[PDB]
Amino acid sequence: KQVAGYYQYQAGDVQITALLDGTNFMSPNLFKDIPQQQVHEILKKYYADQEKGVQTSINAFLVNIGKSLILIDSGAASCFGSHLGSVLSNLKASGYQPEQVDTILLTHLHPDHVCGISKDGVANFPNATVYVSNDEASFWLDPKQAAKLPKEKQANYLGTVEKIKQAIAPYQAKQRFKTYKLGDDIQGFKVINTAGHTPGHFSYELKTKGESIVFIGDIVHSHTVQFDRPETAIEYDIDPKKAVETRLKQFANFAKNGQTIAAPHLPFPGIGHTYSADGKSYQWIPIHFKD
Amino acid sequence: KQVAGYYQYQAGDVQITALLDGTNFMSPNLFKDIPQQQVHEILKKYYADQEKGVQTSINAFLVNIGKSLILIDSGAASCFGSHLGSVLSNLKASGYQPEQVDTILLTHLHPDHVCGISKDGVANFPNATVYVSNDEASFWLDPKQAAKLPKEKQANYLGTVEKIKQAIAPYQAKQRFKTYKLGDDIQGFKVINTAGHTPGHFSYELKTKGESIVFIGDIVHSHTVQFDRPETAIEYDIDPKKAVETRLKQFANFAKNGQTIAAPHLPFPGIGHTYSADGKSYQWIPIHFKD
């Protein structure tokens, strides 16, 4: 019965399509260094205090800039179980075709962003080249990195390394998996270092006529706790301190300058703006549905 | 290109289908007796201050209670021009068929709520009987009253009376235009008097297992100005003071008791909850998309 998970946002001559991969329900305990009672207070304000968990969208974004169609993150495919992986189905439902995707930009290599580039070990996007930051690929694809982290963290790392390798293998085989450095522009997108969540996490800025859109990646995981209390890290952050520093910097910029935001973990479609009354707390303003 | 304007909200064993009729952009002077500078400040906070006007959804709601399919308001059909009138198309897009509708509940007889029940004098919902408050019918259907409104308001009244009559005629002819009074229930929906916007404006509440849902009608026309400043009347209200008094009462209830809200003029799908930090200002918390 439910509507398909795509939404079309128009930015002048550019169409951005929000694509839903699925919905998670995470433990409120994943929010770090904040009393759980205050977490529950914030969730109750936003009518989001469900015993099932903290509802969290996983989104990806298609950007039609006229001559090119670029995909920004791709969802999880099958890497995290049956409830995710809807990105490709919604791309097709939206009217686009996977063969039309020319470029894929990855904010980082966590499986819920990279795995969607492939399915059953073959590329979903046969004409696309995949980009991710130099720093990000270095961290996940160095066979020496595993000894450089505490034993508690080694199993998880190795496990996601395998999922990463399987997704990108079909693109490496075609010489279509690329890395970039700061200062690099790709398809008119500007790359912005927003490290912390992962060592090479980047966001991507698209400037169009009269509107800037930032595809922020995982500098935030909630429209609730981390907006009222932006200093709140989450357990998914590899460097929580650095990730907090990064969010506070970017949210300040967004509140002041009013960029349109596209986020993989804000409520689908995940497109909106951030307001702040005082520079201390922020409020997520979703865009208003436009038929 | 754009996704169809229907959305499924599940409440226990009840399915609520939000249906988009279209989108209006009203001038900011429609908000009464509030400095336009403050209106503009608030619009800016919610990134809603665009040159063409204040974006305002027009929605209707299907409620599937298992044994009955009920439609709550119906959009504007052709009564206001061609940017509106999508409800029937979106109903069909959602998978339902108009023959399945057995009950139509009207919050009030404004054209953007009643005209959708028919298309040029033929019933869109052949199996449905329509209910509206007796106070409301009395106000619009007593061919004297036109003379008791201020002279500058009479022409509009006569104008909308004729649209109302055109739309309800084919239901009256089948003995299927009924009125009710306070204390009556219809298909297990409770009626709530919320007069002011129109003299017989009513809201409808459904108690499901674990959740109460109020279909509030036109006690509000914005998620912005009239939440941050809930005392702000709108030029569309027939009795602004009363309409303000009604909104204030209901929003205090909603903030306290946490009812789920379904509104025809909040941003589509128009479903969410009301929060307040101080009993003075309110915040619209939209629901989080669930695949």
Ligand SMILES: [Zn+2]
């Ligand atoms: Zn991540």
Ligand SMILES: [Zn+2]
């Ligand atoms: Zn993620």
Ligand SMILES: [Zn+2]
């Ligand atoms: Zn009205």
Ligand SMILES: [Zn+2]
């Ligand atoms: Zn209305």
